[PDB]
Amino acid sequence: GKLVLAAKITHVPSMYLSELPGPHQGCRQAAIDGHKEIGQRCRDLDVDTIVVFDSHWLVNSAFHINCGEHFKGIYTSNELPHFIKDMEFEYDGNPVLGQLMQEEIAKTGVRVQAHNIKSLELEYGTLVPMRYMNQDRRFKVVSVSAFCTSHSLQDSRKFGEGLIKAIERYDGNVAIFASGSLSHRFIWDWEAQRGMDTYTREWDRQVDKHVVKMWENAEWAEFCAMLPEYAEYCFGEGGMHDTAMLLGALGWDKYNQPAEIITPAFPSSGTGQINAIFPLMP
Amino acid sequence: GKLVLAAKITHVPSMYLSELPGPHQGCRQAAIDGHKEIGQRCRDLDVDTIVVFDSHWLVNSAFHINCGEHFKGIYTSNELPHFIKDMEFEYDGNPVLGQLMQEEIAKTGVRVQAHNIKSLELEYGTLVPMRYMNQDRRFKVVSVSAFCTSHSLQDSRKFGEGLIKAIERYDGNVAIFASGSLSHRFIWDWEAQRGMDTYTREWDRQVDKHVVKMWENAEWAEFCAMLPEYAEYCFGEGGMHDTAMLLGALGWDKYNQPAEIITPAFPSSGTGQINAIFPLMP
Amino acid sequence: GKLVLAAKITHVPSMYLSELPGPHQGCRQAAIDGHKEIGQRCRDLDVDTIVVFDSHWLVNSAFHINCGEHFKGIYTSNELPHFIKDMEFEYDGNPVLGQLMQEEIAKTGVRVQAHNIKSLELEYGTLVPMRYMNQDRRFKVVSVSAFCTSHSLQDSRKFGEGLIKAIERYDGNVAIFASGSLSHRFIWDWEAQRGMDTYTREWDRQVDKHVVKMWENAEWAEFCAMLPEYAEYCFGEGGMHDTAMLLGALGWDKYNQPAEIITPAFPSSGTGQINAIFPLMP
Amino acid sequence: GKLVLAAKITHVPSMYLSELPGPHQGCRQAAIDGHKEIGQRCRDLDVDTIVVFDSHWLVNSAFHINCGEHFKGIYTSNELPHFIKDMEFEYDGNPVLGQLMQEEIAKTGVRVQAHNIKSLELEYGTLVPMRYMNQDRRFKVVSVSAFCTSHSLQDSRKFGEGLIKAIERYDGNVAIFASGSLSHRFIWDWEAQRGMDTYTREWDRQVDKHVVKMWENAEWAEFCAMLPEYAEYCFGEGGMHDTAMLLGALGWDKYNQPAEIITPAFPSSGTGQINAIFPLMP
Ligand code: NA
Ligand code: NA
Ligand code: NA
Ligand code: NA
Known part of the structure; x- marks a missing residue:
């Protein structure tokens, strides 16, 4: 098979808050637009499976692949229980790609496990893009743990390299999404006052502007x-392992294509958020 | 009402692994016996509700109380889903103690929300002690978010202080558990060969020995x-807000009682674990 | 009196190495010509006294001013004593500007001492610019301790603010130099082979490029x-108190003039170096 | 020759302040007593040369040995110029030991330079012990740069290992002093009011109490x-390279003798200070 699209995307809970009646209604319309645009490009390019590097799925040991056959359930946020609760979802999985990923990534020396367990539910970094892109179940979805507490960024690079070798063996077109942040120094609890549209630290704002350039x-x-x-110094969501997996798949220091910015970088509760397409090398 | 028992307890996943057939069967017997001993004293002291400061429940904004009327479901770990999966649980809740906690803690100036929502499930740091202490549903349970990413430890102190005032207004006896760690520098992914009974850094081992003294x-x-x-320097599980909530309830720098070590400090996957009773001030 | 010139300047030891016969002769010609250019503008503006914020002078307690009447001695580097040794110098001092500085800066609440002591010698961050700008003793010199181990950058801001008041009371024209670095993560001892013209970390290189922009x-x-x-994150030379003293004198967050880059940013032994004029506000 | 004594010793400026008339007179008498006791043991053991690991001598590149033939001068503190100024000293050097040290330490792979330069003056970490122990010039002195900004503690270990091989070739008895601190988080500038006899952080006090045990x-x-x-976490004076050089010479993880406490650990301007003899292995 073929990698046909790669992207860095936001999954901030304010995207769901933007859908709700209230003074925040529409506050994340541009971020939602970005998801729906990336979804449309995946339709245009005949993507059959999406792999999400989920910076909301916390693991202490090895890299884990949720390649469940079928995902169906009801999500309630443990961050914002009152606002994001009883959210229905249903998506098709790809156990076959999951196993190819386990086999090829394990050949790089990376410790990696594939799970096809009905009760292992999709994490939030995967549910958000699927909400905006895949409500008609056009795409199969596989999720990867990218909140890695005790892991090497070189191993996330290798995870991305091995993923390409899995796609080569799979009979279909695949898209990959790093679902996470730029800087992620979440706004201090005693500064809630300031609302959801500010950076905690000018430092993180400026480093994020440089990185986007x-x-x-x-x-x-x-x-x-x-x-x-x-x-380290910009408090990456999950340690920026999602960014490392994406850059791994694309060629690391040999990657040579200018990012296409879909949603310009914006603060959300003190953190940096962006939607960007990483064009494929020739 | 009355606070009658306070404790720091471990919730490491190796406690469940200890139950399973294999070369690790019985690897956490004494940790499990410590949970059972603390539960039995709860029975002896006519405890009707346990409040758990759950260092596995991650929140970015405010302190959250899970005071659901009823807890029933099937738990699958997203950290070790091959071993910890399809784990049944059912417990009774205490919405009345929850709303009192919200009332009294909000008067301290702390940002606090109480949730009585069917679909808001118990987190792992609450499920583990309920598994060893509360299978017969002797105790009502309330859970507090203690993985606090952007929070002052002085506010966790104030959470504990407000909780005493809530218990004073409640008609019954209450126990509190800080469910978390000493040091929590989880063993590096590339050091899996060392197994589950070592510290990552001698530094953490030695600081933890000083702290227990x-x-x-x-x-x-x-x-x-x-x-x-x-x-900060010993990578506390959820920032040690669980420890701060417990010490806040007990009197903070005026607390004057020697800890009773129920289970001696032990390493678990690089991290420091203990069970300890904190006797109440006269 | 009048502040008539402000600058950030390099004092790297490779400037003296550039003068010596060998394979590195001329390796810092442009940095030296930047010093000479800034010196000539001081002549043109009728500067009588230069105040140097010396990021090579280490202090643990309070801000110290060397306002000695006369500076004469022989300088041997304790960093590169094989190459920088028996270096003769002689300059005139300004005890009157020093006492005005102590008077006005103490009114800000900053802890500040002024020294007029024969045996208190000029530090390296002052000797280097005086070597290239002041060999004919055109200028009086005063030095300020800017390697501050235990100090608030807001107090370095107040030091600069007070200095403007001292200059207003002084009968003459004054120039101020922050003598120090951008990033100062000095090259690791085991990486000696890479030589004198590289950054230790790409991270420092990229932050420094954003800062200069x-x-x-x-x-x-x-x-x-x-x-x-x-x-903190780019290991500033002396904690960048030199930069803070300079911006304090210029108006801090109300400063509104584009820096004039006299010598483009260059790596030196892993660290970032620049010569820049900070034009004065109308 | 033979290593006959090893010690960790303080060099705090408050030792000189203790000698002066004022409210602080005698405030460091016990620290002075410790130096003079260690001096007397060096006389009892027929020491002819003392090597000091000077955590006040800052270097960015390589390890430097001050093995000058003769040291004579007047010292003025740039930390406390008013109180510690025009301090006379005169001591005999040992260029022969210095050259053996360079030869043997350079065989371990460590980058090391020996300097025999009249104008390379003794640093403060060396002048303090020599003031209390060697006013009659009973001992020759060699100084080593131990404020190492960019260096491996394993290289400081190898410097100590090589030093023993140098002493074996030298015709005399040698003593080694690590001249530095335990924790060295110097008291914040805005907390001057608290005086010189407190820790900045209870954290450093407690870690220091554990380390001494x-x-x-x-x-x-x-x-x-x-x-x-x-x-790292206790802000070591010069990064505790003085401590690593001493433990290097003594056997590192094979060293097996309990430290003899000469001056019990005491706070000095927020830092931890101790005098201790490290008995030689049989
Ligand atoms: Na948000
Ligand atoms: Na464990
Ligand atoms: Na240099
Ligand atoms: Na002192």
Whole structure:
């Protein structure tokens, strides 16, 4: 098979808040537009399976693949129980791609497990893009744990490299999404006052503006070299393992295409958020 | 009503692994016996509700109370889903204690929300002690978010202080559990070969030994003063807000009782674990 | 009196190495010519006294001013004593400007001491610019301790604010130099082979490029807001107190003039170096 | 020749302040007593040369040995110029030991330079012990740069290992002093009011109390394993390279003798200070 689309996308809970009646209604319409645009490009390019690097799925040991056959349930947020509760979803899985991913990524030396368990539910980083892109179940979905507490960014790079080798063996077109953040120093509890549209630290705002310029200028050797420090000093969501998996799949320091910005970087509860297409190398 | 028991307890997933057939069967027998002993004292002291400060429940904004009327479901770990899956549980809740907690804690100036929502499920740091102590539904349970990413430890202190005032207004006896860790520098993914019974860093091993000595010697003024640095430099599970909520309920720097070590400190996947009773001030 | 010139300047030891016969002769010619250019503008503006914020002078308590009447001695580096040794110097001092500085800065509530002591010698961050600008003793010199181990950047801001008041009372024209670095993560001892013209970390290189862009675009409110994080995460030389003293004198977040880059940013032993004029507000 | 004594010693400026008339007179008498006791033991053991690991001598590149033939001068503090100024000293050097040290330490792979330069003056970490121990010039002195900004603690270990091989080739008895601190989080500038006899952070006080117990219990494998973290999280004076050089010479994780406490650990301007003899292995 073939990788046909790669993207970095936001999954902030304010996207669901934007759908609700209230003074926040429409506050994330541009972020939702970005998802729906990326979904349309996946339809245009005959994507049959989407792999999400989910920076909301926390793991301490190894890389985990949710390649469940079928995902059906009711989601309630443990962050915002009152507002995001009893949310229905139903999507088709791809156990076959999941097993190919396990086999090829395990050949790189990466510790990796594939799970086809009815009771292992999709995490939030995967449910959000699926809400806006896949309500008609046009796409199969496979999820990867990207909130990695005790892991090497070089192993997430290798996870992405092995993923390409899995796609080569799979009979279909695949899209990959890093579902997470730029900087993720969430706004302090004693500063709720300031609302959802500010950075906690000007520092994170400025580093995020520089990083977005690096993406637009295809400075990927330089970005890949500085990613450990960006992930540490800018409090990356899940340690920016989602960003590492995506760059791994694309060629790491050999990746050479300017990012196409879909949703310009915006603050959300003190964190940096963007939607961007990473064009494929020739 | 009355606070009658306070404890720091482990919830490591190796407790469930200890139950399973294999080379690790019985690897956490003494941790499980410590949970059972603490439960039995709860029975002896005519406890009707347990409040658990759950360091596995991640929140970014405010302190959240799960005071659902009824808890029933099937638990699958997203950390070790091959081993911890399809785990049945059913417990009774205490919405009345929950709303009192919200009333009294909000008067401290702390941001606090109480949830009585069917679909808001118990988190792992609450499920583990309920599994060993509460299978016969002797106790009502309330859960508090103690994985607090953007929160002051002085607000966790105030949460505990407000909780005492809520218990005073409640018609019955209450126990509180900080469900979490000492140091929580989880073992590196590339060091899986070392197994489950080691510390990641000798540094964490030695700081944890000093902290347990301080607890045993009632050095609570000194321990409270050093808690922000301990949480940072020894990678506390959820920032050690669970520890801060418990010490807040007990009197913070005026707490003067020697900790009773129910289960001696042990390493678990690189992290420090203990079961300890915190005797109440006369 | 009048502040007539402000600058950020490099004092790297490779400037002296550039003068010596060997394979590195001329390796810092442009940095030296930047010093000479800034010196000539001081001559043109009728500067009688230069105040240097010396990021090589380490202090643990309070801000110290060397306002000695006369400076004469022989300098041997304790960093590169094989190459920088027996270096003769002689300059005139300004005890009157020093006492005005102590008077006005103490009114801000900052802890400040002024020293007029024969045996208190000029530090390296002052000797280097005086070597290239002041060999004919055209200028009196005063030095300020800007390697501040335990100090608030808001107090370095207040030091600069007070200095403007001292200059207003002084009968003459004054120039101020922040003598120090951008990033100062010095190259690791085991990486000696890579030589003198590289950054230790791509991270430092890229943050430094963003910071120079901010300076060129007069984004001073943003730069001032991010300075505490920059100094911490990019290992600022002396904590970037030199930069803070200079921006304090210039108006801090109200400073609105684009920096004039006299010598483009260059790596030196892993660290970021620049010569820049900070034009004065009308 | 033979190593006959090893010690960790303080060099705090408050030792000189203790000698002066004022409310602080005698405030460091016990620290001075410790120096003079260690001096007397060096006389009793027929020491002819003292090597000091000087955590006040800052270097960015390589390890430097001050093995000048003769040291004579007047010292003025740039930390406290009013109180510590025009301090006379005169001591005999040992260029022969210095050259052996360079030869043997360079065989371990460590980058090391020996300097015999009249104008390269003794640093403060060396002048303080020499003031209290060597006013009659009974001992020759060699100084080593131990404020190492960019260096491996394993390289400081190898410097100590190589030093023993140098002493074996030298015709005399040698003593080694690590001249530095335990924790060195100097008291914040805005907390001057608290005086010189407090810790900045209870955290540093407690870690220092644990470390001193480890020394007294000969827990050297454990202490050596945690030293990188101690040096980082407790703000070690010069990064605790002085401590690593000493433990290097003594056997690192194979060292097995309980430290003899000469001056019990005491706070000085927020930092931890101790005088201790490290008995030689049989
Ligand atoms: Na948000
Ligand atoms: Na475990
Ligand atoms: Na240099
Ligand atoms: Na002192």
